[PDB]
Amino acid sequence: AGPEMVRGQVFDVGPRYTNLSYIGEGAYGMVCSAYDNVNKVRVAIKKISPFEHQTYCQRTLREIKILLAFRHENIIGINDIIRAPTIEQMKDVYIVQDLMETDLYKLLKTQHLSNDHICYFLYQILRGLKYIHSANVLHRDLKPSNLLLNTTSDLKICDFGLARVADPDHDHTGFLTEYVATRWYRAPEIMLNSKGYTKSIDIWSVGCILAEMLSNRPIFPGKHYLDQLNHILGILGSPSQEDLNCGINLKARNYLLSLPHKNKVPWNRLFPNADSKALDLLDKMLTFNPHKRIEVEQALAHPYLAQYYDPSDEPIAEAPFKFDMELDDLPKEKLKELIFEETARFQPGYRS
Amino acid sequence: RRKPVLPALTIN
Ligand SMILES: Nc1ncnc2c1ncn2[C@@H]1O[C@H](COP(=O)(O)OP(=O)(O)NP(=O)(O)O)[C@@H](O)[C@H]1O
């Protein structure tokens, strides 16, 4: 028979998965809720059609490889992957995951969080992140819409399409031309260094998220790159000379010195109704200079989370994660083969 | 004694 359909789009996951309801669209996939008739559970299914473009294929391969390699309570898993039996026939890929109730972006449109919830949410984020960082992997796109929640306050990080292995040496010129939904959560060094990605970029994003939980508005909004930077300066204040002593590329430090001086705004002024323990560590998380910026282990070990910190119940990766090749290098026809092989273990016959 | 509860949230 014919395939199931949602908003005029083929969603070909039957007969195993039925009763599809649209949830949302990211920039890259259409997501539905569904019913798994085999396991008798509700699931989420993400439809991805990435084969016409190299960057999409890159994102898809990374997300799959990473989520399949990670197993951790605070990171969304992949339960199943549906795709055609031959490579020529494969035009879409469906990723099946546990169905969560909402994301933190949606939640915050509708309500204000009690300090307890914020605290617990923050703990879970950092717990997931510690795990991710232990494998020397950086998420690089943490933001409220990537934090899935349910009504019991369980939280899971999703969306690893931009993840990569931590390397102090890679060039930034991709990953800026490439589209993301927001940018309000990007560390300043991403914008003004010319080389590399470090674990500190994820921490900055966590800081931006904490701020957002406290006030229900993004702390560093902005429309384009220079505008964005201005918002950060207008709060943290113009950078110290020691701050301009770093990986900051010149033509950025000159741009910085070019700027009219700005005064720091005290945290308690921006967030009057915020637990003081939270504003400390918010400060430690949103520091302009990556080197002094608090690390994930330390952050878990800050007073604000004291009630949750439990090094015994905070798992780490067995080993670092590795990509054999630079995915930026590969053309889309190659990535397609890699995605086909990577998904083969969910195929009926599969060898090993 | 692991999981902290914590009143339920209401989701639209
Ligand atoms: N497992 C899930 N359960 C419930 N809702 C989900 C689930 N996964 C994703 N969603 C929702 O669907 C939206 C889009 O998913 P997402 O994985 O972020 O797609 P994307 O194009 O890969 N990444 P992005 O564009 O940054 O949102 C999310 O922001 C969630 O609200």
CATH number, domain at A179? 1.10.510.10
- Report angle CA A58, A60, A65 to the nearest 5 degrees: 95
Tally the domains of chain A: 2
What range defines the domain where residue A264 resides?
100-328
Note which residues in 1-12 of chain B have CB less than 8 A from chain A.
2, 4-12
Distance CA A250, CA A284 (A): 26
Do both A85 and A181 map to the same domain? no
On chain A, the residues whose CB falls within 8 A of the CB of B4 are 120, 307-308
Strand partners, A81: A95
Both tokens of A130, joined, read 């510690």
Same domain? For A94 and A185 the reply is: no
Q: Tell which A residues from 66 to 105 touch B, by Cβ distance under 8 Å.
A: 101-102
Verify that A196 and A298 share a domain, yes or no. Answer: yes
Q: Please indicate, yes or no, whether residues A73 and A83 belong to a single structural domain of this protein.
A: yes
Identify whether residues A304 and A340 lie together within a single domain. Answer: no
Question: Do residues A12 and A148 share a domain?
Answer: no
Question: What are the residue ranges of helices labelled H in A12-114?
Answer: 54-69, 104-110
Residue nearest to atom 19 of ligand 1 (CA): A26
- Strands of chain A, DSSP E: 5-6, 9-10, 17-25, 29-36, 41-48, 80-82, 93-98, 102-103, 137-138, 147-149, 155-157, 164-165, 167-171, 195-197
Sheet harboring A93-98: ordered strands across? A17-25, A29-36, A41-48, A93-98, A80-82
Q: Does A311 touch chain B (CB under 8 A)?
A: no
Is the domain of A73 the same as that of A84?
yes
Name which of B2, B4, B9 is nearest A151 (Cβ-Cβ): B9
Closest of A145, A143, A262 to residue A209, by C-alpha: A143
A216 and A269 together in one domain? yes
Output the CA angle A77-A82-A88, nearest 5 degrees.
Answer: 135
Q: Looking at A135-224, list the stretches that DSSP marks H as alpha helix, in order from N- to C-terminal side.
A: 188-192, 200-215
Burial A153-192 (b: 16+ CB within 10 A, else e): bbbbbbbbbbbbebeeebebeebeeeeeebbbbbbbbbbb
Verify that A307 and A289 share a domain, yes or no: yes
Tell me: do A136 and A266 sit in the same domain: yes
* CATH of residue A60: 3.30.200.20
Annotated binding residue A165 = no
**Smallest CA–CA distance from A310 into chain B, residue:** B2
Q: Does A29 show up as a binding residue in the annotation?
A: yes
Residue type, A34: A
User: What contacts A99, CB < 8 A, 6 or more positions away?
Assistant: A33, A34, A41, A42, A43, A44
Which among B2, B4, B8 is the nearest to A120, CB-wise? B4
Resolution in angstroms comes to 2.2
| Determination approach | X-ray
* One domain, residues A165 and A292: yes
Are A138 and A190 in contact by the 8 Å Cβ rule? The answer is no
Distance in angstroms (rounded) separating the CA atoms of residues A184 and A228: 7
A92 labelled catalytic = no
Q: Are strands A93-98 and A80-82 parallel, antiparallel or unpaired?
A: antiparallel
The total of other beta-carbon atoms located within 10 Å of residue A350's CB is: 9
Query: Residue length, chain A?
Result: 352
A207 with A268, same domain?
yes
Coil, strand or helix: which one is A190?
helix
Per-position b or e across A20-32, b if 16+ CB within 10 A of its CB: beebeeeebbbbb
